[PDB]
Amino acid sequence: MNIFEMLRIDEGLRLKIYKDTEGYYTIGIGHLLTKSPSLNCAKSELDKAIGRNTNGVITKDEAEKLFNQDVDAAVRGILRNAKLKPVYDSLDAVRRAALINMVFQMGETGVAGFTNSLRMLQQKRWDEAAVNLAKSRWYNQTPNRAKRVITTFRTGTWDAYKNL
Ligand SMILES: *SCC1=CC(C)(C)N(O)C1(C)C
């Protein structure tokens, strides 16, 4: 297991524009195109992301290219963020993956708002952090995925993604 395999499980792979859990047009492995309710807009965003006039359909290689960019972007977003970087630096590589997962899903600003959880993670109070992480819109709206990420922070293992 690693952050790519982890997010491929949590995000899936779809080659045609689809709406994500929040109703927003997305493609590939969780690549958000736009919050606009316009499908033509989503397609315009898609075409400029991949560099060609798509029909709203991409290949697996193109999906993977966007996904690599998006994972890289989440990591660099963590390392540029004054609240997230010290927590990231303090973690082991498995828990680091859990933090990248969260930023991938909700963005740097949303994760940086989890001030209590981030303090408990930095303190390595893992069970307390797991309890606080669940007290969130995040958990309530995507509870199975949040449980997997939370189990990763609690245990520092990949047990929630084993067999998946
Ligand atoms: S992506 C922005 C956009 C796309 C399109 C559907 C052509 N639009 O009318 C606006 C400019 C909203």
Experimental structure resolution, Å: 1.4
**Domain chopping of the chain, boundaries:** 1-164
**Residues with active-site annotation:** 11, 20
101 vs 98: CA distance, rounded Å: 5
Question: Distances from the Cα of 154 to the Cαs of 41, 66, 98, in angstroms?
Answer: 40, 29, 10
- Name the residue of 17, 40, 53 whose CB sits within 8 Å of the most ligand 1 atoms, as the mutation to test its pocket: 40
104 known member of a binding site: yes
Contacts made by residues 138-146, CB under 8 angstroms, sequence distance 24+ = 138/102, 138/105, 138/106, 138/110, 141/21, 141/22, 142/21, 142/105, 145/10, 145/105
16 three-state secondary structure: strand
- Looking at the chain, list the stretches that DSSP marks H as alpha helix, in order from N- to C-terminal side: 3-11, 39-50, 60-80, 84-90, 93-112, 115-122, 126-133, 137-141, 143-155
Q: Is 47 in the pocket of ligand 1 (CB under 6 A)?
A: no
* Best residue for ligand 1 mutational test, from 38, 39, 45, 47 (most atoms within 8 Å of Cβ): 38
Q: Which residue has the tokens 């033509």?
A: 40
Q: Which CATH architecture has domain 1-164?
A: Orthogonal Bundle (1.10)
For residue 71, how far is its CA from the centre of ligand 1 (angstroms)?
27
Ligand 1 atom closest to residue 42's alpha carbon, by position in its atom list: 1
Q: How far apart are the first and last CA of the chain?
A: 10
Q: What are phi and psi of 60, to 5 degrees?
A: -60, -40
Expressed in angstroms and rounded, the spacing between residue 7 Cα and the centre of ligand 1 is 30
Please state, as a whole number, how many other Cβ atoms lie within 10 Å of the Cβ of residue 11.
Answer: 20
